[PDB]
Design a protein around this ligand. Structure first.
Ligand SMILES: [Mg+2]
Ligand SMILES: [Mg+2]
Ligand SMILES: [Mg+2]
Ligand SMILES: [Mg+2]
Ligand SMILES: [Mg+2]
Ligand SMILES: [Mg+2]
Ligand SMILES: [Mg+2]
Ligand SMILES: [Mg+2]
Ligand SMILES: [Mg+2]
Ligand SMILES: [Mg+2]
Ligand SMILES: [Mg+2]
Ligand SMILES: [Mg+2]
Ligand SMILES: [Mg+2]
Ligand SMILES: [Mg+2]
Ligand SMILES: [Mg+2]
Ligand SMILES: [Mg+2]
Ligand SMILES: [Mg+2]
Ligand SMILES: [Mg+2]
Ligand SMILES: [Mg+2]
Ligand SMILES: [Mg+2]
Ligand SMILES: [Mg+2]
Ligand SMILES: [Mg+2]
Ligand SMILES: [Mg+2]
Ligand SMILES: [Mg+2]
Ligand SMILES: [Mg+2]
Ligand SMILES: [Mg+2]
Ligand SMILES: [Mg+2]
Lengths: 152, 206, 262
RNA sequence: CGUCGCUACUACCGAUUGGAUGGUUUAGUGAGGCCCUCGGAUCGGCCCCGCCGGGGUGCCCUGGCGGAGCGCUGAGAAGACGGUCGAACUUGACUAUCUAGAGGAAGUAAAAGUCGUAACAAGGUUUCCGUAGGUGAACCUGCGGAAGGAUCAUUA
RNA sequence: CCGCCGGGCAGCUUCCGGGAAACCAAAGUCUUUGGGUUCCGGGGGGAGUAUGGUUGCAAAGCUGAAACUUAAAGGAAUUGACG
RNA sequence: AGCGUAUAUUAAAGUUGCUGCAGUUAAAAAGCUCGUAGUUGGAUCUUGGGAGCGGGCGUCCCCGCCGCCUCUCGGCGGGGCCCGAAGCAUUUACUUUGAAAAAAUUAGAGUGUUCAAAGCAGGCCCGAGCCGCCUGGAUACCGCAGCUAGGAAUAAUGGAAUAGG
RNA sequence: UACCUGGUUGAUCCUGCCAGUAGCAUAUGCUUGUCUCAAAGAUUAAGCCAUGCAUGUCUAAGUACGCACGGCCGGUACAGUGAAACUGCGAAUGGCUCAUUAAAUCAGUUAUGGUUCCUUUGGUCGCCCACUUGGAUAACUGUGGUAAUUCUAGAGCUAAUACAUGCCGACGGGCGCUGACCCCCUUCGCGGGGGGGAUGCGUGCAUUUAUCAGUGGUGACUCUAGAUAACCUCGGGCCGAUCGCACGCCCCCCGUGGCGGCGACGACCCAUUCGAACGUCUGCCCUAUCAACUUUCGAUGGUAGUCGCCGUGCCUACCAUGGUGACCACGGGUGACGGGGAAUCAGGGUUCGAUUCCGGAGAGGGAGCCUGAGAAACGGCUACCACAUCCAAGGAAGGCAGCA
RNA sequence: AGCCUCUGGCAUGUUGGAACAAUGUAGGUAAGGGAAGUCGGCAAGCCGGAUCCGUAACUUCGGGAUAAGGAUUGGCUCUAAGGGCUGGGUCGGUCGCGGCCGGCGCCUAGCAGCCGACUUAGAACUGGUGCGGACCAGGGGAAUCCGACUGUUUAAUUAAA
């Protein structure tokens, strides 16, 4: 179920999985030893990364990507793609003439690892600059905080 | 020629980028290898850096391995099975990274039959009786008998492999780039791997 | 561009081979070397521009191809071979041998040293390597690698390299309390003991530095190259000793030396 | 103030599937290069013999002169099948820009022609808006408005 | 009838203070310049025209240019002078 | 020794008005109303006070203090001591200090170019016997965004209520 | 220097404009004694171009046997100047111009842990021809064509650091697994323990694949390093084991064997330097008489691929059905190469910045190409298109946006 | 629809034989040109099916409209894509492979086997560019006049306005 769905076999490389000629059922209890990493900057590699049965190469909590540069935040506006969302960064660009500001935004597509469950729209989300991961997407979601506004 | 550039295609929004420069030696694309199975044929290519690149166009053999047993005899690649990308590359027998391929079992057989000294497939007593016991029947004993009785239970194989060795062909998957590298290197499909790809093959043919 | 650029316009030329707007179009361009183009002194500038030893470029050509000039005791015939922080430049038929320490304003001195003190030399370290078969490598700021270093040498520390041998001889880890000349930016060729550094992950790290008189500049780490255990620089310093006098003070102190001096 | 009269200049409308350049490109065709598959002018080398000479143990190692299998790898040009970028050419589409035009209708000039006299004084008919309808021209008349009036009132 | 109170329609009066002026409890708080915000004008005509778009069954509605020409057109109040 | 006209453009233009125009009549406020974006949005939350040093027995100006938490984390057989980590500055906006900011240009240190535009040298020591000394090539700005560190005045923004620290 | 004056009206106060004013920016009108600085075919036509030139190179150290000249002197190959020719570099910088280009150039900022790098620096280099083996062309010599070119026909020679080839080395010596086996202790013997092993196969710095363990290094390894199994990108990995000029030596020792300095090219691992490249964040002119755009002709994403230098809808296949928008997209325009600055200027702006400094682009226009580290290179070529020269009519040579 | 065939029906539509003249009536085809043809393009041919692409002026906002204008189409070998039907209550007990009870299971993401029509898309290969190959089968455009459209009409010369 669930994991091997696509066509080619999806597997964490740097775990070779088989060797077994001993008792204690078949395979281990974890069964597959799961490659995960700590990322850095203190963000807790979340539970569902380590627990998770799942597999996405582009997740930093379970695969090959390096986070390495510019850390930002935005808000989640659309989750209609698969393993990617759109965030929307708001601001004041300043004119000097007119000694005031105007609101702006540059929405930004961004990888969203499915470890990182129960996200919604109107959701504060922090992102790391990553490898240029798809055509638009250079950023990867690191800590969703769902915070400002509404409810647990 | 056949470039590789962000320079031409639309922007995120859908506006059309104008050009900028000409194509530069840079965003350079060569045509494909789409390497086959025949007697070896590889052309070099001169690339960026200086440096070179071993584009295989005919390729017969691979340096490609057990996972578990921890060996890798060099072996003939007999035939392509399915390739997840696309279903011309199967038919045309085009080896590319993550092709599933049949290969010769023979060089893997012939070091159990050294090491743990227990057969594969099943036979009456034609090859087995003259040659296995020619590998067995000791006149050293003591140290060795202890040794490949310490090579214990776990001279063992999964049924799924055990099967294939009857046939003298193993399922394996390419992990090098024949077009980039120059070789058709890989692992043996072993255990979990080995079970879609059969079930893919089975479901595919019907 | 197509290839790499083998040329340098005067003006674009950094602020310190100290060149003037007239006299030419081009500046000399460091031939590639150990030191980065922007933090150099192409030999040529010593000779005609700093010492007034030669006059022109051809005068310098005729110097270095007698083979008098020895940049760290190894003879250079390239008029544009780049020197930079912590070099030697022995003349030998003269017995002068200078360094290349920068002044308090950051503009490479004409600071003469002994015949001794042309052996010891300093070098900051850029990385530990672990090369192959566990043979460990340094990378000095002057692009020496030195195999087989003492395992307690870490990154950003300095080495008291010999010269005729290469090699290393004793060394200074980068703690608090030791002595720093600054090799980048603004507080440049300014000298003082550390105090405290501010580790940041990602963006490179800040280093607070106190000096003799008690003036705290800070810097990015990658500009600080150290020079002693603490209030004891192993090298001779330039007159001024990277203290840096406010234009106000400098003005008056220069002018106050004047009149009383006779 | 307007029609009307004459003269001059702008842009307008305008029958003419009006003309010209540019940019996209739908469709076709498609130079040359680049890749792939062949090819094989040829050129060797390896070799196999005939005969001969020098050195070695009939045989071998070298040498000389001839011949032939052109055996089997290498190099290898001209060429040809395919594929890919693709100028170019041909026909459509769009949009941009720019202009040719019989004849028609404004404005302006502008500024002194004729016929009136619309407006400003209660402008002789308070004036004006919108709408409508009319009329040689200002115009006129309905209806509803407006006072920017010609009444801040009409005398319980 | 006589008061008060809220919010309505209004009146007079005044050297607040405004206001080119006529006037204005507000058009007051403005070189002592900014409480919030919407619309919208930049000499007069050409012109609310041409063209384009759109709505309308259509009158028409809405959006809405330029070349050209033009020196004032205009507003408030003053004396005139003619009704 | 220049001086004229040709026109683009700036002040002049309080005639494009952010600062900073105007809308009874002068050109001008939709016929009226609803209303999504945008802009804009009352008040309300640590203080008075303490302890000292310093100006003018006490009173009145002037300064370092009473960021909290942690010590779950380092260590400068049981330790402390507190820095190393993080709760993190609710989450910013704001402000101040760093660092980084190519030169030329600019602002502007230094300088008998004979002055000046300039130039960056020059100055000196010297009767040259010195067979040579001495100093420069200053500095400030460098928007916004980005990076760092103080402050918490105001503006948002957050947290416990079908229970939770 | 915070700024005004003329003009509507019998006269007034306004709105408002016209007209003055100064600088700056470009025309040319006239005049011109000295001297110092000093811009210059950008706007129109990145239109066209006569001609003249703008990119060659030798130390002692890659070949040199031109008879060129000497030498100084030979016979021994050299000797020493040395015209040519092969070879290695460069020619990838500079110079010019701004046609295009509106988040595109570009600034600042960051990334490369999603990469390549000639050169310089530092390093590192021992597995029967090495007392170097083979072979082949240019100059050179001769015989040739064509009308003509920076056109070659063809016969002899002859070099190499050009092109191939491939050896001593190292230790029948050492260490991985295999091991003909063997010995001793223990055991009734099986078995348990201690040993020791001829002979095989391996006998690596790089390569690719596979696996295993966890000296040093980061906020950030799926890194470096280490262990095992393999292969050979194989001629087209490397070194592995490369060639000149100075010629100077010592030998428990006589002529061999050891040694000395310089260079040149290698190179592999590597560092480094000039970079180059592709990414992050944030930054632009006008326009709605442009409101929806984008999507089987990749639009956004996932998966798997091919290609490249690398991550990447760079491309293919199969899936999903996305992404942007009045915080004004999308569409159109520019008398738009982008910055750094300029003249203006009470404070705030306004326009200009083709302008020497930085960044980009293009050599009539496009495309493709060789070659190269490095170029899609125009002082290369290949066509086409677009231009244009000589002609013996068969053919040939054309690119000033190098300087004149 | 056309065209070829079984069942069923005929025997060429009131005669035959021999040639292949002119005129005819039915069919065909033409180099180069291409309406010059006549009163006039009178007849015929161009077009023609499907799939894909694509689409004007004008409007009664339905249409126009198969507008216009393009591409493809064979045979062969493949691939891909479209559905039905049945099956777990297994473990224990007990009763006769069957039932009943009770318990666990509970594919509730289904998976397994067994059936059977058809289509559609894409890819090779392949043939002297042939492929809607027999037949079926809209020539198009720009205008004016009339009549709103459907229909009807002078049976034996007018179908129109
Ligand atoms: Mg302002
Ligand atoms: Mg009026
Ligand atoms: Mg008002
Ligand atoms: Mg105001
Ligand atoms: Mg006007
Ligand atoms: Mg102005
Ligand atoms: Mg002003
Ligand atoms: Mg005004
Ligand atoms: Mg109103
Ligand atoms: Mg004045
Ligand atoms: Mg008058
Ligand atoms: Mg004026
Ligand atoms: Mg250049
Ligand atoms: Mg680098
Ligand atoms: Mg134009
Ligand atoms: Mg030209
Ligand atoms: Mg170019
Ligand atoms: Mg070109
Ligand atoms: Mg040229
Ligand atoms: Mg008949
Ligand atoms: Mg009949
Ligand atoms: Mg005909
Ligand atoms: Mg006719
Ligand atoms: Mg007909
Ligand atoms: Mg029609
Ligand atoms: Mg009809
Ligand atoms: Mg009839």
């Amino acid at each position: 179920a669930d994991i091997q769905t696509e066509r080619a076999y999806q597997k964490q490389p740097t775990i070779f999985q088989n060797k077994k000629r001993v008792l204690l059922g078949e395979t281990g209890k974890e069964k597959l030893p799961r490659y995960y990493k700590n990322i850095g900057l203190g963000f807790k590699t979340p539970k569902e990364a380590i627990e998770g049965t799942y597999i996405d190469k582009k997740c930093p909590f379970t695969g090959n990507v390096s986070i390495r540069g510019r850390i930002l935040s935005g808000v989640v506006t659309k989750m209609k793609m698969q393993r990617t969302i759109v965030i929307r960064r708001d601001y004041l660009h300043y004119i000097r003439k007119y000694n005031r500001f105007e609101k702006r935004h540059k929405n930004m597509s961004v990888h969203l690892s499915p470890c990182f469950r129960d996200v919604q729209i109107g959701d504060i989300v922090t992102v790391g600059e990553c490898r240029p991961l798809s055509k638009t997407v250079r950023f990867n979601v690191l800590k969703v905080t769902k915070a400002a506004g509404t409810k647990k | 020629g056949i470039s590789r550039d962000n320079w031409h295609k639309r922007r995120k929004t859908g506006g059309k980028r104008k050009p900028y420069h000409k194509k530069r030696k840079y965003e350079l694309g060569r045509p494909a290898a789409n390497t086959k199975i025949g007697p070896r044929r590889i052309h070099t290519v001169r690339v960026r850096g200086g440096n070179k690149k071993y584009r295989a166009l005919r390729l017969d053999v691979g340096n490609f391995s057990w996972g578990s047993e921890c060996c890798t005899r060099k072996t003939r690649i007999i035939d392509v099975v399915y390739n997840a990308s696309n279903n011309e590359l199967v038919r045309t027998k085009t080896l590319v990274k993550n092709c599933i391929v049949l290969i010769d079992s023979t060089p893997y057989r012939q070091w159990y039959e050294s090491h743990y000294a227990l057969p594969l497939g099943r036979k009456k007593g034609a090859k087995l009786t003259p040659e296995e016991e020619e590998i067995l029947n000791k006149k050293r004993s003591k140290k060795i008998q202890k040794k490949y009785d310490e090579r214990k239970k776990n001279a063992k194989i999964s049924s799924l492999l055990e099967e294939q060795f009857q046939q003298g062909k193993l399922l394996a998957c390419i992990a090098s780039r024949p077009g980039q590298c120059g070789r058709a290197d890989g692992y043996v499909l072993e255990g979990k791997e080995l079970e879609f790809y059969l079930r893919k093959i089975k479901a595919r043919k019907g | 561009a197509r290839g790499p650029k083998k040329h340098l316009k005067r003006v674009a030329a950094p602020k310190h081979w100290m060149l003037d707007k007239l006299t030419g179009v081009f500046a000399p361009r460091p031939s590639t070397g150990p030191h980065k183009l922007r933090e150099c002194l192409p030999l040529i500038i010593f000779l005609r521009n700093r010492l007034k030893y030669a006059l022109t470029g051809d005068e310098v050509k005729k110097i270095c191809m007698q083979r008098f000039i020895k940049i760290d005791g190894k003879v250079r015939t390239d008029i544009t071979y780049p020197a930079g922080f912590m070099d030697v430049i022995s003349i030998d038929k003269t017995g002068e041998n200078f360094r290349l320490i920068y002044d308090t304003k950051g503009r490479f001195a004409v600071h003469r040293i002994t015949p001794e003190e042309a052996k010891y030399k300093l070098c900051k370290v850029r990385k530990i390597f672990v090369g192959t078969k566990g043979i460990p490598h340094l990378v000095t700021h002057d692009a020496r690698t030195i195999r087989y270093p003492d395992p307690l040498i870490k990154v950003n520390d300095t080495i008291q390299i010999d010269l005729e041998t290469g090699k290393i001889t004793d060394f200074i880890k980068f703690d608090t309390g030791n002595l720093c000349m600054v090799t980048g930016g603004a507080n440049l060729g300014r000298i003082g003991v550390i105090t405290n550094r501010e580790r940041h992950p990602g963006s490179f790290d800040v280093v607070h530095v106190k000096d003799a008189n008690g003036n705290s500049f800070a810097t990015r780490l990658s500009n600080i190259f150290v020079i002693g255990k603490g209030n004891k620089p192993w090298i001779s310093l330039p007159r001024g000793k990277g203290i840096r006098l406010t234009i106000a003070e400098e003005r008056d102190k220069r002018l106050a030396a004047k009149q009383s001096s006779g």
